[PDB]
Amino acid sequence: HHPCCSNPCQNRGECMSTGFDQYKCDCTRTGFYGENCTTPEFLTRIKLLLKPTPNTVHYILTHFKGVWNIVNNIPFLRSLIMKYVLTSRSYLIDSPPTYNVHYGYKSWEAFSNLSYYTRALPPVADDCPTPMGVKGNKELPDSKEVLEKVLLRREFIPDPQGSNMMFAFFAQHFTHQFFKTDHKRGPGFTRGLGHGVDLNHIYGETLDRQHKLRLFKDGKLKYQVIGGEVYPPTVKDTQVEMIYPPHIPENLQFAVGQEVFGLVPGLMMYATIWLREHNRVCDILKQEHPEWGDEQLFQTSRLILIGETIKIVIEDYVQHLSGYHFKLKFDPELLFNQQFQYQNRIASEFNTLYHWHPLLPDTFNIEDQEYSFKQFLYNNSILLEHGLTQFVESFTRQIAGRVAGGRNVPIAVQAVAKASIDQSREMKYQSLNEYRKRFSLKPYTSFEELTGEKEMAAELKALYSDIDVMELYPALLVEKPRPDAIFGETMVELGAPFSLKGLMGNPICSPQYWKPSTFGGEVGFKIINTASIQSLICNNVKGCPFTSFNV
Amino acid sequence: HHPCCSNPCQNRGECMSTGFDQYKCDCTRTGFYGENCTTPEFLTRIKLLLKPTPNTVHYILTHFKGVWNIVNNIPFLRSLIMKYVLTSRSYLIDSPPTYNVHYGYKSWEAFSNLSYYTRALPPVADDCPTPMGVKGNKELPDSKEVLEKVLLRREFIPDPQGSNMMFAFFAQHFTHQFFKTDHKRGPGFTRGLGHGVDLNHIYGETLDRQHKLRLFKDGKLKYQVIGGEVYPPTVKDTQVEMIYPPHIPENLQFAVGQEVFGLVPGLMMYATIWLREHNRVCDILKQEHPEWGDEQLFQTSRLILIGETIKIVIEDYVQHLSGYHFKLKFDPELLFNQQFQYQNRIASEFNTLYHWHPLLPDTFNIEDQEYSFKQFLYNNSILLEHGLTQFVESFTRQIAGRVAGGRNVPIAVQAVAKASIDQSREMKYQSLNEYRKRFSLKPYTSFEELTGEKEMAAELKALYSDIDVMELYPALLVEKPRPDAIFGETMVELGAPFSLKGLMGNPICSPQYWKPSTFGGEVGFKIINTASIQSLICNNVKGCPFTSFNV
């Protein structure tokens, strides 16, 4: 078996076979040396005793509301802090990217082939003696047992942070531009070849789909008017392929950039809101530039919408998820004198950790109705019946589920939850503890320490035996949450570097792009820098209902 | 007409229309302000009073051999100087990239579509009153007339810097991995989607082509053995498409990563040398790693050859061209504490300036024979007849043509020389003087100042009327050379930023890749960091003949 199977190399050191049964660790720039990269250099030892733990940092950022209130009002100070949040998080991501499901060593194939998700840790080699390497039993516990014992919802557990359905649907719509598993090829492959925030879920992944969605007048997207309301055009009108089961009537097959977005009326609500936003931006641009043509109106609006998206995601979405009293800021200039790579490759494990199915409620409650999963799925009649204003007002009020803490996956999606476990193993993911060490976190020393509780911990001990072979995905969903929080530490500490990297990595954030003329002048540039989830709804939904990401 | 037609914004200010007959310049981070970005800030005023001209710096680099001898052997000084070279040149290149032939403003399409070459200057708008904007006549002079009066060789002008045919064929083999114009789509499009030094000219641009070239044993590339010598395998054996006339003997239809390389035996010489190098690195790695299979042997050799290529290009090829007494160094670590983007997009103008037609001799002299272009073209028999040893010995001794200085384009390639002019015009290139200002050079104030001479200057004055509409490509070939140099200022000052950017921008130069484990341990790493043009031939050509890029 591969001499690296036991993952001997510590502290981001890299393992290489040097014979059939010997390895060498490459400790370059890790700040450690010795056979396994565990002897700290003097200056490292100094950093290690002065580094606060992630839990300490969390405490600080979630208390002293009064101090943060002052901090938030000193632009100089707010910038300093926001800069440090960006730099520290991004240093954890390999960029240019390295490994993928087929390459546990760096290769040109893994670097150059955009069809793969990248990998933050290399796969476990095919010939290892146990699924996690050398530890644990020959087989991992039946995934149906893991799912049933510690993942499936008994009573609905509401998110104590107050996340609503506007938030759950925003997360689903936004992340589905960059998590687009290519099932013809397997779970380690993506169809999102732009690998980030390019708004392909609005404009289409390829030029051909974009051209069928565009009106070719005024920079606009095609649309239809139903009952005086603007909605996406149909499949029949556009020839844009969409995934619909065969019983969907032609007039109900809306066409949008992402072909799975007809699956869910919460996804279509966002699709329709963003299509309106693009056309509203074209209108403002045409007023600023009566000399411009359609192609430039269209491309400039798309750049403006990419900036609006990043800005909302940082200052509304991540803000709300963080629970911080510090006010996060979208400001590309904070990086202009730092070392930072303006590029991103989507990581398989970032896709895995975003499988937030416990966020889903037991029913979808719009106005006086409570729809089951079966009535909601595929059913865009519900959208037309109630209308966008009612959808916003209903979803803003309805609470989502807690994600960490265990037993909160709705039964309606049990096959999806089981697939995440199975596919993690097909992709030969290393263990939870290897992933915690990869992200500068202490390994968990027991199931009880992971869960913070006794009963789920004891079920997992019986299922897995050894904490060091506990798997990443189920651990994210059973992990002890922060006090009154939606997530536990592992979710935050992996999720935040992948997220900030992907947001800031965008070329629009680069110094040659981040200038008013990129966006058609100061008016277009202000649209980005003042965008918000409330303004997005206010500008594009009749009556301008109030909204946010909390109930 | 477009109000930016006259190129009103200076100092890398960006021009935008603000109504039908009005523009705004965006002076963001230029160090200038005012309507056209021409009023310098105080620090800018200071930094401009202190900056030496390129010709002063070139003079210092090519004199005081005595001092440079000292500097070359003080590793700390050498590194400090090489560091400054890398950083100051790279800063001129937009990265992430911006314009292309269809987009004279930033857009997602121009960012994301890898089929385009990028553009260092936006194209002249389609509706400008003259080819170059607003200056000059309604039509540029007939390209055949410019070609015949100032470009065509009367008698062969030797390169005074002593470049040889090893150098000339190395330039052509090396640059044709990244200049691969997609003539199906147009001159502003490329088939080299890796946009740099990925060695697709050895390994194939696509995975399907790579797999047909590979042996699948020991990491190796397929090959044949003719009269005891190793050569690339055939088109028949591999089913790899190559460009060859119908008459070529089956066994001379050599198949290599790049489809056009059977065109010229000097290109097949280097293809053959590099195929041998790949398989020799396979043998070294198999010895080091008997545990490794074919796939990892193949990928790790590729990474190693990519490193060897960068190494030789900087320390042999660019060293030679530069004329400097300072010893250039390939060392990724010099950029580790600098701001630098590990990515590259090939510029259309870098392709245009690399049209080094005048390097070609009047005949190709091997051993006793002197072959004409007609006899040399598509003729791999000559390679087999003389053998690689004789190739290297003859090409090392045969001098190449001078590139600048005018009238040195061999007539056998006059059609290609005329195409460079016609296609520059189709891609709506801005003028020489706009390019010189883009790269911080003073615009030429007369045709005489451009050429350093009278007769060509007078022909060009009558052809073009205004120096501000002289064209880039033909200016590079008539420009007054540096003293006994192969190139003028404009060639070196545009060429060096594009070159060093594409060299250092490669992911293998990034801190996560630049580690001995990437290359299979210390043995593979050393192969890279001790590569030269001499060791390349010594290891792979029977008898280990002396070679160099000069004499």
Ligand code: COH
């Ligand atoms: C972001 C939070 C979130 C939410 C709220 C959510 C809500 C819902 C929902 C009700 C509206 C339904 C019916 C489903 C059903 C599914 N989900 Co999501 N999912 C979410 C995050 C994800 C992610 C991320 C993936 C992987 C997508 C991929 O890789 O293509 C996923 C995968 C799936 C798949 C697998 C098919 C595939 O194309 O990979 C199904 C089926 N699920 N989910």
Ligand code: COH
């Ligand atoms: C670098 C030095 C160099 C040399 C020594 C050289 C030597 C030779 C040679 C010797 C046997 C022959 C027969 C030709 C003939 C040709 N050259 Co070159 N070329 C060179 C630099 C280039 C470049 C760069 C291009 C554009 C390549 C592309 O875009 O595909 C080119 C283009 C061409 C093309 C067609 C592609 C195009 O873009 O128009 C032909 C045909 N030529 N050339």
Ligand SMILES: *[C@@H]1O[C@H](CO)[C@@H](O[C@@H]2O[C@H](CO)[C@@H](O[C@H]3O[C@H](CO)[C@@H](O)[C@H](O)[C@@H]3O)[C@H](O)[C@H]2NC(C)=O)[C@H](O)[C@H]1NC(C)=O
């Ligand atoms: C990168 O940009 C290239 C230049 O735009 C582009 O090539 C172009 O692709 C389009 C659309 O696929 C082809 O045009 C076709 O448009 C309609 C679509 O319904 C067809 O029915 C027409 O008959 C026509 O064939 C363009 O001809 C083609 N232009 C070229 C090759 O110069 C690439 O598609 C873009 N690449 C990517 C990844 O987007």
Ligand SMILES: *[C@@H]1O[C@H](CO)[C@@H](O[C@@H]2O[C@H](CO)[C@@H](O)[C@H](O)[C@H]2NC(C)=O)[C@H](O)[C@H]1NC(C)=O
């Ligand atoms: C290097 O890390 C390795 C891999 O775990 C260590 O090797 C194991 O060490 C344990 C405890 O000392 C023993 O069971 C064996 O000696 C090792 N196992 C195997 C399979 O060899 C090693 O001791 C660490 N090396 C150093 C020098 O600290």
Ligand SMILES: *[C@@H]1O[C@H](CO)[C@@H](O[C@@H]2O[C@H](CO)[C@@H](O)[C@H](O)[C@H]2NC(C)=O)[C@H](O)[C@H]1NC(C)=O
């Ligand atoms: C910016 O450049 C513009 C356009 O190139 C200048 O306009 C010219 O300036 C002077 C007028 O005194 C003349 O040389 C030209 O006849 C003018 N041409 C046009 C089209 O206006 C303008 O002055 C520059 N602005 C500044 C403030 O320097």
Ligand SMILES: *[C@@H]1O[C@H](CO)[C@@H](O[C@@H]2O[C@H](CO)[C@@H](O)[C@H](O)[C@H]2NC(C)=O)[C@H](O)[C@H]1NC(C)=O
């Ligand atoms: C990226 O890698 C995938 C997986 O290797 C490649 O997909 C395969 O293409 C091969 C070789 O042409 C085929 O035999 C199979 O049809 C594909 N295998 C799959 C999908 O798993 C893909 O071609 C690569 N992309 C690029 C640009 O090279």
Ligand SMILES: CC/C=C\C/C=C\C/C=C\CCCCCCCC(=O)O
């Ligand atoms: C391409 C990826 C770009 C954006 C991804 C968007 C949202 C994901 C945000 C967080 C995932 C879980 C951790 C939450 C981050 C809050 C903590 C912090 O700001 O440090």
Ligand SMILES: CC/C=C\C/C=C\C/C=C\CCCCCCCC(=O)O
């Ligand atoms: C893809 C880009 C990578 C490599 C470029 C390859 C060759 C370029 C070399 C010459 C173009 C003219 C450059 C002369 C540079 C010498 C001066 C200097 O180093 O500053």
Ligand SMILES: CCCCCCCCO[C@@H]1O[C@H](CO)[C@@H](O)[C@H](O)[C@H]1O
């Ligand atoms: C080498 C191909 C020459 C083709 C001749 C057509 C162009 C003639 O051009 C003339 O050539 C003369 C001879 O060198 C020069 O003295 C003139 O200045 C030049 O205009």
Ligand SMILES: *[C@@H]1O[C@H](CO)[C@@H](O)[C@H](O)[C@H]1NC(C)=O
């Ligand atoms: C779809 O939802 C509508 C409400 O608009 C409901 O009346 C109908 O029964 C649903 N259809 C299905 C197939 O569940």
Ligand SMILES: *[C@@H]1O[C@H](CO)[C@@H](O)[C@H](O)[C@H]1NC(C)=O
């Ligand atoms: C090709 O080269 C051979 C020598 O190897 C030469 O004698 C022959 O004439 C050439 N063929 C053509 C078509 O010129």
